Structures are given as C-alpha cells and as structure tokens.
C-alpha cells in the first residue's frame, strides 16, 4: 500500500485499501472509512467494479438525463467518488470549510455553500437526485466568482469547478463533444 493518503497526500493513521494501493485517512475517505469489513475496498475499486459489472454504462450520456437520475446507490456513490476527486486537490482547502463575507464593495451570497456541507448532505441521504449534488457543488463556485468580482482570486473557482467538470464528465460517462 501507499505510505500517504490518497486524498490530502499526508501521512498519519492510515487505512489501507485491500484490492488496491491506496490508502485513507477515515474521513478523506468518502464515505468515511467503514469500521470492519475485511477485505476493505476503497471507493477507486468500487467505481472499477460497477463499470466492469456493466460495461455499457460507459456509452455517452446526455447531462440532462443523468441529473435527473434518482439517488439510488450506484448514483450515491457516483457522487461521493466526485465529491472525493475534488477534495483531492489542494485548491479545494478553500471551498472546504463554511465561508464569510465582508469584502468593501461585494455583497455574500444569498445562499453559501462549501464542501463539508455537502459531505453531509450526502451523508444524511439528503439529495433525492443527482441534480440536487451538481447543483451544490456548480453553486460553490457561482457564489464565489460572484463575490470575488475582479480580484484574481476568483480563478480559484474556475480551476476546481474545472476539476469538478471534467471528473463529473469522466464519473457519469458523459457524451464528448466539441
Ligand atoms: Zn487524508
Ligand atoms: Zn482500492
Ligand atoms: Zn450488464
């Protein structure tokens, strides 16, 4: 196994994966790391299973059909894998925690959103749909592009949406297009 977390590429107490290399700290796994289950397989080798059990789910897809696709469990860990992926950049330290607003001249958003909340939000079985975690997680970065107007911070929205985008696109074998 790996001697660093795959998520924050820190050491520390680690839980080793049982069918591949990686390793987790408990709650950089997503969801957190399960308290027996020998074997333990992480959420890399659960995504290869679903994708090996039914090779057509590659096939592209349309957006609007996928985010309409209730949150059954192949879809709940679809979206925890991909909230996983964006954690796993250190850009996303910023989106991670529950943010304030006093900038002169900016106004916060109407409706703030980061991370952790949707952590638990998946967590808790919140969202009924897959539209309801994209719509979250876009809204992270729309509050932030917003708040931060000019100033060149707000490129750290663009670069994890980005991240965010194309493991969204890989994730749910979305379409390619031009
Ligand atoms: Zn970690
Ligand atoms: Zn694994
Ligand atoms: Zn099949």
């Not at 349309?62 to 979206?79: A, D, G, I, T, W």
């Not at 330290?93 to 106004?107: D, H, I, T």
């Amino acid at each position: 196994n790996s001697n660093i977390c795959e998520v924050c590429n820190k050491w520390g107490r680690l839980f080793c994966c049982d069918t591949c290399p990686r390793s987790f700290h408990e709650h950089c796994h997503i969801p957190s790391v399960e308290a027996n289950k020998n074997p333990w397989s992480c959420i890399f080798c659960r995504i290869k299973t679903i994708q090996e059990r039914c090779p057509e789910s590659q096939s592209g897809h349309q957006e609007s059909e996928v985010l309409m696709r209730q949150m059954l469990p192949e879809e709940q860990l679809k979206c925890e894998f991909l909230l996983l992926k964006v954690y796993c950049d250190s850009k996303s330290c910023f989106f991670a925690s529950e943010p304030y607003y006093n900038r002169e001249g900016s106004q916060g958003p109407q409706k703030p959103m980061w991370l952790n909340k949707v952590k638990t939000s998946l967590n808790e079985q919140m969202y009924t749909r897959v539209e309801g975690f994209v719509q979250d997680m876009r809204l992270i970065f729309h509050n932030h592009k917003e708040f931060y107007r000019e100033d060149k911070f707000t490129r750290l929205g663009i670069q994890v949406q980005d991240i965010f985008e194309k493991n969204f696109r890989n994730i749910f074998a979305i379409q390619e297009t031009s």
